[PDB]
């Protein structure tokens, strides 16, 4: 019983974190095999940030300009290349702690754990979701650049995010591990803003199924809805449209609890209309959207508390 | 910017988790040096001394990854079983066993079959339970804090109470709360809100640019404590006021000034507003957790 925002154990990622310094800029790098991956803005000197020409800045650098530190050991850079917004530093030592890993690009609504780091040293771990507006609501201070997001389903680390910047509203933007930004963001200090964000509907439904599994049904009602009528109502509350793929994905939770997906949609519509009336759902007074259907299945019991 | 429920990095603890099997019962153990610590109910009105004397070392199957450790001795200390093994854990971090107080927070590395599954942050409630997330087989999972390079183990999971909350012991086997390790009628007592932690979280909200709840008013500690008693909030002591000193100096809001804000929030609610993305007053961040997250301390 219980339901917490649960991160993956961070040990496999901690053994990959390094400090990368280029001139006066210091940030974090991810050391996998003989390559250290880090944001390419480590080569910018703050003024450069308005309109940096990364190709022009990088050509003026040699391997010895990049100082990489793994614990109290200096790694030697023997090559460098830029792939999109990531710098790949070839080092002369393969990381003996390299876990089994993959680079994966995620879709909005997907969750992942973030190992926040400063100076190549891990500070904390928390759970995050890729917002529909492609930002993440993280907890990052200056120097956190290069911290990574990941999942560890079945002892393989799937790296999905590398931290690059903080937008004016306090939210965060970054890239996949191939250096492609999530969202329309650029690694420039030009005027940029997060678009209007929306609630991840499929995740809220998953969390309502988690509440039923843990024993709570107060919010259910005798009604159902069509998918189209649900979306027409949900769009009015700034909720993401629910697609047939989302209905399919919720199939297992629907079968475990005996509540049809469109019947859970009717409960959500009513919650949006009425609010919670002094009640809570899984210790929350707000509808939670940072648990996916997969996260609920991972954490919750396979037996509903009837 | 941002404020999340953040756990300590779990790597130093992951390298200590093992699977302990005795008969049909399988749970988790903590392997430090040449000893594996686990709940004594793995041997299971139980007379633990009588049940343990009937066991031999070879009855305890301990597995660290895909390697079987051999048990060469066993002893009980309160509600923890200490299994002496022939191999010292080469991954043993610098550590201490500490007993925490209600209101203090810690990270939990939830495990099943000696394999870590997740990490989350929680607080020892004033009623000595924790609002964890544990399923059958999670017994022996541990709670900890990290100070510099030293892991301070403070909790070992033993059981789930009927309300879905959890109970356990420190690493010396002393339960937190009036609980016993047996199948008998037990219940969590009425819980209260950790006042000093709510104030710490309000300071975190102010640091993050959430100031709508601030007001021109102040209060005495005695008048605030009358209000705290009314809403099932723990009393705020002069020690708590002292502990909040740094956050008070950073934000320019006196501790008693923040108390008048909390009093108004208790008497009037949030009125459709949120604080740090929450519609409830959050009490599972200590003042130290706020300072650490708003300063980027590393391990
Ligand atoms: N290094 C920058 C940044 O956002 N850095 C921070 C990241 N995360 C969190 C931060 C919190 C506070 C201050 C800074 C933070 C500094 C500001 O200009 C840009 C612009 C573009 C890019 Cl790609 C990076 C930055
Ligand atoms: N092994 C017991 C337990 O509570 N174990 C669980 C722990 N966490 C979570 C659980 C979730 C579901 C079921 C079981 C859980 C099962 C019930 O009887 C006792 C009695 C005394 C003690 Cl010390 C332990 C247990």
CATH architecture of the largest domain in chain A: Beta Barrel
Please give the most extensive interface between any two protein chains, plus how many residues each contributes. Answer: A-B, 47 and 45 residues
CA gyration radius of chain A, whole angstroms: 22 Å
The main sheet of chain A comes to:
7 strands, antiparallel
> What fold name stands as the CATH topology of the largest domain in chain A?
Thrombin, subunit H
- Ends of chain A: how far apart? 13 Å
Tally of helical segments of chain A:
8
Spatial arrangement of strands, main beta sheet of chain A: 5-4-1-2-3-7-6
- Count of spatially separate domains of chain A: 3
Structural class by helix and strand composition of chain A: alpha+beta
Query: How does the overall form of chain A come out from the CA principal axes?
Result: elongated
Cytoplasmic side (chain B): 1-299
Protein name (chain B): 3C-like proteinase nsp5
Subcellular location (chain B): Host cytoplasm; Host Golgi apparatus; Host nucleus
Domain Peptidase C30 (chain B): 1-299
Secondary structure layout:
The structure is a homodimer.
Chain A: H1 11-14, E1 17-22, E2 25-32, E3 35-39, H2 54-59, E4 66-70, E5 73-75, E6 77-83, E7 86-91, E8 101-103, E9 111-118, E10 121-129, E11 148-151, E12 157-166, E13 172-175, H3 201-213, H4 227-235, H5 244-249, H6 251-257, H7 261-274, H8 293-299
Parallel strand pairs in A: 8-12
Antiparallel strand pairs in A: 1-2, 1-4, 2-3, 3-7, 4-5, 6-7, 9-10, 9-11, 11-12, 12-13
Helix pairs in contact in A: 3-6, 3-7, 4-7
Residues 41, 134-136, 138-139, 158-160, 181-183 of chain B line the site of one copy of the ligand N[C@@]1(C(=O)Nc2cncc3ccccc23)CCOc2ccc(Cl)cc21.
């Amino acid at each position: 019983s219980g339901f917490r925002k649960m991160a993956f154990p961070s040990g496999k990622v901690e053994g990959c974190m390094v400090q990368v310094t280029c001139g006066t800029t210091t940030l974090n790098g991810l050391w996998l095999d003989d390559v250290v991956y880090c944001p390419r803005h480590v080569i910018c000197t703050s003024e450069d940030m308005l309109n940096p020409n990364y190709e022009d800045l990088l050509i003026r650098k040699s391997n010895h300009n990049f100082l990489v530190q793994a614990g109290n050991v200096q790694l030697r850079v023997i090559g460098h290349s830029m792939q999109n917004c990531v710098l790949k530093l070839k080092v002369d030592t393969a990381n003996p702690k390299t876990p089994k890993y993959k680079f994966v690009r995620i879709q909005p609504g997907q969750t992942f754990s973030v190992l926040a780091c400063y100076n190549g040293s891990p500070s904390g771990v928390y759970q995050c979701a890729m917002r529909p507006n492609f930002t993440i609501k993280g907890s990052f201070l200056n120097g956190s650049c290069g911290s990574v997001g990941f999942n560890i389903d079945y002892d393989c680390v799937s790296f999905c995010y590398m931290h690059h910047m903080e937008l004016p509203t306090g939210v965060h933007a970054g890239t996949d591990l191939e250096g492609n930004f999530y969202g329309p963001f650029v690694d420039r200090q030009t005027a940029q803003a997060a678009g209007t964000d929306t609630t991840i509907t499929v995740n809220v439904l998953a969390w309502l199924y988690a509440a039923v599994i843990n024993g709570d049904r107060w919010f259910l009602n005798r009604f159902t809805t069509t998918l189209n009528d649900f979306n027409l109502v949900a769009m009015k509350y700034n909720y993401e449209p629910l697609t047939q793929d989302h209905v399919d994905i919720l199939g297992p939770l629907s079968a475990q609890t005996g509540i049809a997906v469109l019947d859970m949609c009717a409960s959500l519509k009513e919650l949006l209309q009425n609010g919670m009336n002094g009640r809570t759902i899984l210790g929350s007074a707000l509808l939670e959207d940072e648990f996916t259907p997969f996260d609920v299945v991972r954490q919750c019991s396979g037996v509903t508390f009837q």
